[PDB]
Amino acid sequence: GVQMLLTIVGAFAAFSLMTIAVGTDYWLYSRGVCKTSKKNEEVMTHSGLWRTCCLEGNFKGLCKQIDHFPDTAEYFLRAVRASSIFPILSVILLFMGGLCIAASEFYKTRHNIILSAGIFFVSAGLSNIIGIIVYISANAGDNSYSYGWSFYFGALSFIIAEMVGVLAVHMFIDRHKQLRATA
């Protein structure tokens, strides 16, 4: 159907844009040292979630590993922006939602698989918001910082995930209305 084609495309799109977001290293555009004896560094660097690579300087494309642990209670944040479980939990959920949609087009009659997808997309978009907030709220703790296309993919992925969630619920409603009609 038309409502299904969009769901497949939307599930794929959301999952693709979030996987690229979690992997690419252009989340933030800030000023920082792209290398592990005073060093005249402070060169323009682009950072993702785990790697920071400077945009310019004698180290044109040298990368590094972010050090996320540089006293209590707050720590819990430093450890949620260091595993990045919320961005990664959002990838897993979107993948699981796709399985549901795909499984739906095979078994059929089940109806509750189509719903499950709806719960795995809406929650995926909800994990994403928490990951976005945690990201921003951690950098602030530590300027002309600007955001890159990996941030705006994770923002665009959220939008596509919520819309597929609406669409998947709208298909679940329609499946059940067809049952009530025959009754």
Partner 1 sequence: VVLFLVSRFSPYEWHQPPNEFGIFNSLWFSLGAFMQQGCDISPRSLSGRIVGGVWWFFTLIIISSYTANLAAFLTVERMVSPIESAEDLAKQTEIAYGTLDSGSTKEFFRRSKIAVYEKMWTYMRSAEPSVFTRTTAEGVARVRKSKGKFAFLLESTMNEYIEQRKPCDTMKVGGNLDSKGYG
Partner 2 sequence: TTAEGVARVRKSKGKFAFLLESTMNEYIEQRKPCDTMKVGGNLDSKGYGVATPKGSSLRTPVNLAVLKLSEAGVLDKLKNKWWYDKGECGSALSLSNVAGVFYILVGGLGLAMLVALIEFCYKSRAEA
172: partner contacted, choices ligand PLM, partner 2, partner 1, none (Cβ within 5-8 A by kind): partner 1
Token pair, residue 116, equals: 């499950």
Chain position carrying tokens 């495309």: 9
- Name which position in 122, 150, 154, 157 contacts partner 1 (CB under 8 A): 122
SS (H, E, C) 2-57: HHHHHHHHHHHHHHHHHHHHHHCCCCEEEEECCCCCCCCCCEEEEECCCEEEECCC
Token pair, residue 159, equals: 């939008």
- Name which position in 127, 135, 165, 168 contacts ligand PLM (CB under 6 A): 127
CB under 8 Å to 181, separation ≥6 — which residues? none
CB of 93 to partner 2, least distance (A): 12
Helix (H, G, I), strand (E, B) or coil at 172: helix
136: partner contacted, choices ligand PLM, partner 2, partner 1, none (Cβ within 5-8 A by kind): partner 2
Assess 166 for contact with partner 1 (CB under 8 A). Answer: yes
CB of 76 to partner 1, least distance (A): 21
CB under 8 Å to 37, separation ≥6 — which residues? none
**Residues 87 to 126 in contact with ligand PLM, rule: CB under 6 A:** 119, 123, 126
Query: Between residues 14 and 28, which has the closer beta carbon with respect to ligand PLM?
Result: 14
Query: Which residues would be at the binding site for partner 1 (CB under 8 A)?
Result: 115, 118-119, 122, 125-126, 162, 165-166, 169-170, 172-173, 176-177, 180
Query: Which residues would be at the binding site for ligand PLM (CB under 6 A)?
Result: 119, 123, 126-127, 130
